[PDB]
Paper text:
Here we introduce the first crystal structures of the [name] endo-levanase [name] (EC 3.2.1.65). As typical for GH32 family enzymes, the [name] comprises an N-terminal five-bladed β-propeller catalytic domain and a tightly packed C-terminal β-sandwich module linked to it through a short helix. The distance between the nucleophile Asp41 and the general acid/base Glu221 in the structure of [name] is 5.2 Å suggesting double displacement mechanism of the endo-levanase reaction with retention of the configuration of the anomeric carbon atom. For [name], respective amino acids are Asp41, Asp169 and Glu221.
The 508 aa-construct of endo-levanase [name] with C-terminal Hisx6-tag crystallized readily and yielded large (shortest dimension ~100 μm) rod-shaped crystals. While the attempts to resolve the phases using only SAD data failed, we were able to solve the structure with phenix.AutoSol in space group I222 by additionally providing an ambiguous MR solution as a partial model, or in other words, by utilizing an MR-SAD approach. A native 1.65-Å dataset was subsequently used to further refine the model. In crystallization trials, ZnCl2 emerged as an essential additive. Once the crystal structure was solved, the reason for that became evident: the protein crystallized as a 1:1 complex with Zn2+. The ion was tetragonally coordinated by His26, His384, His503 and His506, the latter two belonging to the Hisx6-tag, while His506 provided by the neighbouring symmetry-related molecule. Thus, the formed crystal actually comprises pairs of endo-levanase monomers that are linked by two closely situated Zn2+ coordination spheres, even though the asymmetric unit contains only one protein chain. In addition to the genetically removed signal peptide, the model is missing 14 residues from the N-terminus and 2 C-terminal His residues of the Hisx6-tag due to crystal disorder. Crystal structure of the wild-type [name] revealed a MES [2-(N-morpholino)ethanesulfonic acid] molecule in the catalytic centre with the morpholine ring of the ligand pointing towards the bottom of the active site. The morpholine ring was coordinated by two water molecules and the carbonyl oxygen of Thr104 while the ethanesulfonic acid ‘tail’ of MES was stabilized by side chains of Gln239 and Arg244.
Author numbering: 15 to 506
Amino acid sequence: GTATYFQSSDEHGFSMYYKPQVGFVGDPMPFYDPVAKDFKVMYLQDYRPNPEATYHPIFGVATKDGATYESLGELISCGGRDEQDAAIGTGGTIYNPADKLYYTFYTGNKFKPSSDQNAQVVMVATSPDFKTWTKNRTFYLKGDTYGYDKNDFRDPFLFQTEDGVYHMLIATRKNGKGHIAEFTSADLKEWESAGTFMTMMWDRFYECPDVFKMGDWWYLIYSEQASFMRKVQYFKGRTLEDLKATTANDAGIWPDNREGMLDSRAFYAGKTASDGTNRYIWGWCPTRAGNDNGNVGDVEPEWAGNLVAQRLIQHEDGTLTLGVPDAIDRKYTSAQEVKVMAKDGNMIESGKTYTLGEGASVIFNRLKVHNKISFTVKTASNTDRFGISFVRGTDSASWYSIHVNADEGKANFEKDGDDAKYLFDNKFNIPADNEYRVTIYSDQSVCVTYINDQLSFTNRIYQMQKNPWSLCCYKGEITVSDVQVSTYHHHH
Ligand SMILES: [Cl-]
Ligand SMILES: [Cl-]
Ligand SMILES: [Zn+2]
């Protein structure tokens, strides 16, 4: 009925983009449990603030589908203040059918290490049922034992190849240069160094590496540590040696025309797992200081937030994009009436289509709490620009928009209105036919925008829930059609 701004909040609760009752979701460690036939997503549990020295214990959630989550609680606790794993960093899980134990390798971060100590050491815990985890008190894998780094030696990724060999990939350095080191084992207990799997481009550092085969392609997914990037990226190759060659001697053989950038700065630490039908990626969407959508960090965003699952889309040429998990899409079952609450500028309404010239905007009726928004936008030219706006009340001085800038080949997240400012961007393939098929899935303040199976754009938008949303044209002219909204909760 109203289209004024309302001060919504996140206390109502999340659902598909999970958050624990207390704290926030840091780096996830997804794993397909071959016995339970579901996904176990371990994750670094973050608190605001964290204790000194002993922080980021490993908690877990279980999910069949990336939409419905069961809390598993604390699984691997921090070591004591003075122990090697006082603070725990990211690792990886794998099942061993020979001894029927789950193995989780992880990073032990020493508090205030001395010259002779290692800031980071890879350690392990096992469990027969995924509920009770037992640390191996004699396993300590040190980078400098094998010529790698004493202090950067982290994020172990585990996979078993078809020949039965277990592989562990660890993000580290050799003589300062970033190296993903490989170790091999027959039993997950005794390990040998296989040298360097891949070097990291230039002075980059690849957090949370993830290597897998999908169809006829091998992939490395990683999260760039460099502050100017802070995005999930990937490389591809038809063979493992082709994959490893993409960065050899800084070759920079990008997998596609966007340096393999899958999402932008509000989706981080993405790693994958497959149930044999779909391969999903789990990452986190950061919180914002003061819950201010325009405070995205001076250098890097805040660390940790909400768990976000996406589905890998493999294209005929082997490139990857991300789409919504089908089970998330199916959560939005309650169709809502779509009504125009406000129009401004040079535009025309043609029934259930709207054509907006430069400067024009249409405001639609208030969203609910967990929303699926869909519509089609056709631009007049391949250099036009349009906006998808949230938290835009008729009385709002500022709001937040995804700018789709066809002339620049990318979508931006920006603050609009008073104190407008560009925040970050997300390159994607512009449609030759100028048609943009848009879907947005939201869960309170977390949403992902998908376009044409090409763009996947996660954003933190506090108070998008229970507030109007809007479409606008910045440059050129657009026609909006087929506007639909469906919600999670059902009313009568
Ligand atoms: Cl809802
Ligand atoms: Cl309900
Ligand atoms: Zn709800």
